[PDB]
PDB file of C-alpha atoms in Angstrom:
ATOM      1  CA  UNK A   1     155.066  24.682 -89.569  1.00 22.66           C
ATOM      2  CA  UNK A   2     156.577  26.281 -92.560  1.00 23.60           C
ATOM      3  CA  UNK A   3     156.767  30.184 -93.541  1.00 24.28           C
ATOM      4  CA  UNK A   4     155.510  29.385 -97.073  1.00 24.20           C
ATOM      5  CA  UNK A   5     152.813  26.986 -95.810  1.00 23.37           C
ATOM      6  CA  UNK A   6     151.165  28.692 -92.997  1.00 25.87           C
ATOM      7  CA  UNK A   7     151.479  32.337 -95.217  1.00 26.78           C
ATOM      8  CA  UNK A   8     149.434  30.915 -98.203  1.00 26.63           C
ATOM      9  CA  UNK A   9     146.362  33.250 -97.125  1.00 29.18           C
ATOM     10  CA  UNK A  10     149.211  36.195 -98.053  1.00 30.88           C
ATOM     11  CA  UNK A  11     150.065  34.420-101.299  1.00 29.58           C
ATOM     12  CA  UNK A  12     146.735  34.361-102.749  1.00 28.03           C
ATOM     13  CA  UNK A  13     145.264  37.574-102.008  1.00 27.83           C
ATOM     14  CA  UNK A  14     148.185  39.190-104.209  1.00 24.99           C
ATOM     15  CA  UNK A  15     147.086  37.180-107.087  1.00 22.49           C
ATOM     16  CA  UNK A  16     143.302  38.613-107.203  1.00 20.29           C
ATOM     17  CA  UNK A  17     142.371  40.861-109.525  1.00 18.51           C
ATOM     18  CA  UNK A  18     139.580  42.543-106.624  1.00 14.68           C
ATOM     19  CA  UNK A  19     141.714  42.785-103.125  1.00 15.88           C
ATOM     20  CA  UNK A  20     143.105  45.995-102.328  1.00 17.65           C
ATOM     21  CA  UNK A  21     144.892  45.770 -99.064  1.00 16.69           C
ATOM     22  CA  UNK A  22     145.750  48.274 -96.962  1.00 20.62           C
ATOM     23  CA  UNK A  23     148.173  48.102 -93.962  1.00 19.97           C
ATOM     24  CA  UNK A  24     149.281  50.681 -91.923  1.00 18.75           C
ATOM     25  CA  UNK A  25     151.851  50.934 -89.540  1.00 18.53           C
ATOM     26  CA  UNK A  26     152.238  52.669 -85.987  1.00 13.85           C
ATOM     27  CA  UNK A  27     155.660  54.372 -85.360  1.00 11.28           C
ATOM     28  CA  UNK A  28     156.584  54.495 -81.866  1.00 10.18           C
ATOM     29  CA  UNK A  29     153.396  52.660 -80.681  1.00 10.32           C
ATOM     30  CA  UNK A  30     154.387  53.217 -76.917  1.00  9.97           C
ATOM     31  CA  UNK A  31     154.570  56.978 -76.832  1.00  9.06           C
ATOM     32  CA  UNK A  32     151.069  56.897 -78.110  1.00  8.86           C
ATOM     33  CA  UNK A  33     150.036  53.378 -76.338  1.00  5.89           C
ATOM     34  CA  UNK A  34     151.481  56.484 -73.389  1.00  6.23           C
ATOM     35  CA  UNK A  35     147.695  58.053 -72.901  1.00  6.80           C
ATOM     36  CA  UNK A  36     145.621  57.065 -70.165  1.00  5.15           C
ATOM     37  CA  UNK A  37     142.207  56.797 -72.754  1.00  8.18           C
ATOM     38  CA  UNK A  38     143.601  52.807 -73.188  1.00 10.53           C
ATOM     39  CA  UNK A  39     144.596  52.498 -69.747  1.00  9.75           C
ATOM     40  CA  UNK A  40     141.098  53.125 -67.832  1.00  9.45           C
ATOM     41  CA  UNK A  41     138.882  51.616 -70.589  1.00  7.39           C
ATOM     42  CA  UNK A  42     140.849  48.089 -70.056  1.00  3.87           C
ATOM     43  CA  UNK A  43     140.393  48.643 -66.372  1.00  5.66           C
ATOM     44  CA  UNK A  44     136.929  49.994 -66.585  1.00  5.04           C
ATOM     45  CA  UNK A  45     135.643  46.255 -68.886  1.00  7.14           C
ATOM     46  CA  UNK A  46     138.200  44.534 -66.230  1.00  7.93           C
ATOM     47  CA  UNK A  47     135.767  45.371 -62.809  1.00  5.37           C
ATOM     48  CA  UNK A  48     132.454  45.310 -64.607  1.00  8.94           C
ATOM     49  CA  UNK A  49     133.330  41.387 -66.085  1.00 10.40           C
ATOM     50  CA  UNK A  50     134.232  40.287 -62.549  1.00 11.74           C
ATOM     51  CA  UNK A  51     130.931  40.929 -61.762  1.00 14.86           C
ATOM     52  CA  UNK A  52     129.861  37.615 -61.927  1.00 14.98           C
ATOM     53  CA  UNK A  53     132.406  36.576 -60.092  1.00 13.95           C
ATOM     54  CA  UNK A  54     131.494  39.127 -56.900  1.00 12.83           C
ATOM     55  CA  UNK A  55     131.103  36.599 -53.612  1.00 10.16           C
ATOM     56  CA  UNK A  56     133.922  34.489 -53.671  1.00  7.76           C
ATOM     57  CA  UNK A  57     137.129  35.986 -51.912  1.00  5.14           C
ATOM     58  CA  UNK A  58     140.693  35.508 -52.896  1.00  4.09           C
ATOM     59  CA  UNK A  59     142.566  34.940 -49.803  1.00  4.78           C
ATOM     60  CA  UNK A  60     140.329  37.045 -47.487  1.00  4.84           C
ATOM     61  CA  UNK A  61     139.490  40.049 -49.601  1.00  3.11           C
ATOM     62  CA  UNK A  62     137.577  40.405 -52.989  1.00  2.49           C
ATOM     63  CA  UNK A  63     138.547  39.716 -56.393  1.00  2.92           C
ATOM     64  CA  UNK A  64     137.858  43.531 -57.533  1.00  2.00           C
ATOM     65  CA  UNK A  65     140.278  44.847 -54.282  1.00  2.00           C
ATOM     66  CA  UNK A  66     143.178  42.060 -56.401  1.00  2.00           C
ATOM     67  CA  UNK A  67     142.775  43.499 -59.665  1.00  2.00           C
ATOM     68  CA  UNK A  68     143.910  47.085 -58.167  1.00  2.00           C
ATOM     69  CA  UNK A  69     146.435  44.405 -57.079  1.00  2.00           C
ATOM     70  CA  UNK A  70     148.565  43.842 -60.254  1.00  2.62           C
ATOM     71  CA  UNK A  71     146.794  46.951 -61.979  1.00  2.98           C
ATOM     72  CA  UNK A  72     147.461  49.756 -59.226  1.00  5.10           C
ATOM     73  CA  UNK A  73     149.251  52.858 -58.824  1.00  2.00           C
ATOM     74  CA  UNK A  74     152.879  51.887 -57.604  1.00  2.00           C
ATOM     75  CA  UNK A  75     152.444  49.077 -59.981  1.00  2.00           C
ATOM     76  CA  UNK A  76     152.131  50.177 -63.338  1.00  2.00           C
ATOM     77  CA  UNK A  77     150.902  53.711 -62.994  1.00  2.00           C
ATOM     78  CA  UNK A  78     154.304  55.909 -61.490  1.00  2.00           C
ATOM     79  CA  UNK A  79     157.059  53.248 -60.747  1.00  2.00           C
ATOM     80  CA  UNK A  80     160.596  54.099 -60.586  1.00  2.00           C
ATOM     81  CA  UNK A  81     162.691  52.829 -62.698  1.00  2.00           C
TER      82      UNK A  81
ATOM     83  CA  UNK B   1     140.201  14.302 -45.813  1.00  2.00           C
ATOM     84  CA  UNK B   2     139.952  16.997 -43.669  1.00  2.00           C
ATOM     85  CA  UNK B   3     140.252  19.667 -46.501  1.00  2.56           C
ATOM     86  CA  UNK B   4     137.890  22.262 -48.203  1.00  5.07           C
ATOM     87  CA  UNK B   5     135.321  23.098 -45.569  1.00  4.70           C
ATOM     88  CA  UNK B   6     134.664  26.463 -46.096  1.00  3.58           C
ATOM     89  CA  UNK B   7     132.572  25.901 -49.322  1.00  5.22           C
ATOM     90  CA  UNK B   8     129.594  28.079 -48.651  1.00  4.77           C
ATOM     91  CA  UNK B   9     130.178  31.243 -46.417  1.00  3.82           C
ATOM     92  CA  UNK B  10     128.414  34.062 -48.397  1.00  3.10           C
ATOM     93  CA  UNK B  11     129.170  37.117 -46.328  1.00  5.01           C
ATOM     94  CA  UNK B  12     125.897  38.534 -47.527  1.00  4.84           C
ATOM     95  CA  UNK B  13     124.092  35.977 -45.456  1.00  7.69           C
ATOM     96  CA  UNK B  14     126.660  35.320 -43.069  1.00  5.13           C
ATOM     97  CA  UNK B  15     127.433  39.177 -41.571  1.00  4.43           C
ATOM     98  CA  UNK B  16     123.267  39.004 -41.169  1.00  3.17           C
ATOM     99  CA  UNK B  17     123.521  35.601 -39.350  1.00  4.91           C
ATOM    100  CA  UNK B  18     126.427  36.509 -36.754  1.00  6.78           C
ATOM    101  CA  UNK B  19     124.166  39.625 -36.128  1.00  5.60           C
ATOM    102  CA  UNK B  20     120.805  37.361 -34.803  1.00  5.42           C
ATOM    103  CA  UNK B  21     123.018  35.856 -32.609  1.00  8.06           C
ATOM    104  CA  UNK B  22     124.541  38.943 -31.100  1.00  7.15           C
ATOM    105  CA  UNK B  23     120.994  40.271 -30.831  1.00  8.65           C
ATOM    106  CA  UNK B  24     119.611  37.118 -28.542  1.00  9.93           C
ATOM    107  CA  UNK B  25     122.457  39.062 -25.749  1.00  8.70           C
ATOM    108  CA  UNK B  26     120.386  42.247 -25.701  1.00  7.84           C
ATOM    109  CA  UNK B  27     119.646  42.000 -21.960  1.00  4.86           C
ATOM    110  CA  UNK B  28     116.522  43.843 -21.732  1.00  5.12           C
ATOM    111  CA  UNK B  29     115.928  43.968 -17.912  1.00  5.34           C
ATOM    112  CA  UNK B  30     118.166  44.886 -14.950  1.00  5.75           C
ATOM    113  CA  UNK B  31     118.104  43.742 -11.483  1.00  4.06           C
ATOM    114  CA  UNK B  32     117.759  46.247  -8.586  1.00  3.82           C
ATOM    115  CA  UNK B  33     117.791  46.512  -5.126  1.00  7.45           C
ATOM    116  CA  UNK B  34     115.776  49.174  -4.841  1.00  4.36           C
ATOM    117  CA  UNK B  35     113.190  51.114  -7.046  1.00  4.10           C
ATOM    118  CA  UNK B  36     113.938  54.663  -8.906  1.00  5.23           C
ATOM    119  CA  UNK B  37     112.586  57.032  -6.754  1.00  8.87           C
ATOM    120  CA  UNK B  38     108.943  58.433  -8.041  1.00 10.27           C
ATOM    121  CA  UNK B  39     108.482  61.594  -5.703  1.00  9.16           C
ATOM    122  CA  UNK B  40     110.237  64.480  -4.804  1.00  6.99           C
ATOM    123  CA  UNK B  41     109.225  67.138  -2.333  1.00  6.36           C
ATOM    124  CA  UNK B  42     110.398  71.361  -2.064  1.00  6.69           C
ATOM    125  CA  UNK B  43     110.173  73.189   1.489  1.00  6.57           C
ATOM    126  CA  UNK B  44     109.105  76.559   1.701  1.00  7.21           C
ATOM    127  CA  UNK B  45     110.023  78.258   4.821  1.00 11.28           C
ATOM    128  CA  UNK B  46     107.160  76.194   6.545  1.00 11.19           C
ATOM    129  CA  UNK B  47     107.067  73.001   8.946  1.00 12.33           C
ATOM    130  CA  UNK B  48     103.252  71.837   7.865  1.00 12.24           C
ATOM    131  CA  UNK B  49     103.155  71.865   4.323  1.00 12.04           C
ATOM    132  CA  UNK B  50     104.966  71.192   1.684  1.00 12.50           C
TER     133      UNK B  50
END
């Protein structure tokens, strides 16, 4: 689409007299997106929603051995680069 | 037409079905020639009794 068309939602939120809008802004997001706390509570709610998906086996082995897979430790954890 | 034939293998059931059939080769019995021997006797220094 447009900019002005699909931004009209910005447009008309500026012209109320009872909006105030706040935005804030994260400088250097990856030196803080760094800590672990976000990186083991994704991969805690990854294993415990494959949970319904438990008996069927990708290849040979298990869905929750994969997930280690593209999630491990000389994956994204300590890789050289 | 010969594809997808390994729809339903749970290995929850199927570890505990390959085990029945590896227990129906427990061979119980063995066959001998001759029996275990059931007595046993000591000397003592004497040629009548023991």
């Amino acid at each position: 689409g447009s900019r002005v068309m699909d931004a009209a939602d910005c447009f008309r939120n500026s012209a109320d007299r009872d909006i105030f809008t706040i935005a804030i802004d994260y400088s250097e997001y990856d030196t803080h997106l760094t800590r672990h706390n976000f990186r083991t509570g994704m991969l805690q709610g990854i294993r415990e929603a494959m949970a319904p998906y438990r008996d069927l086996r990708y290849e040979g082995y298990t869905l929750e051995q994969i997930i280690d897979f593209g999630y491990g430790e000389g994956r994204v954890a300590n890789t050289l680069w | 037409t010969a594809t997808r034939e390994v729809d339903f293998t749970v290995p929850d059931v199927q570890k505990i079905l390959d085990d029945i059939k590896a227990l129906a080769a427990e061979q119980v019995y063995k066959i001998v020639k001759v029996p275990s021997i059931s007595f046993r006797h000591i000397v003592m220094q004497s040629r009548d009794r023991v």
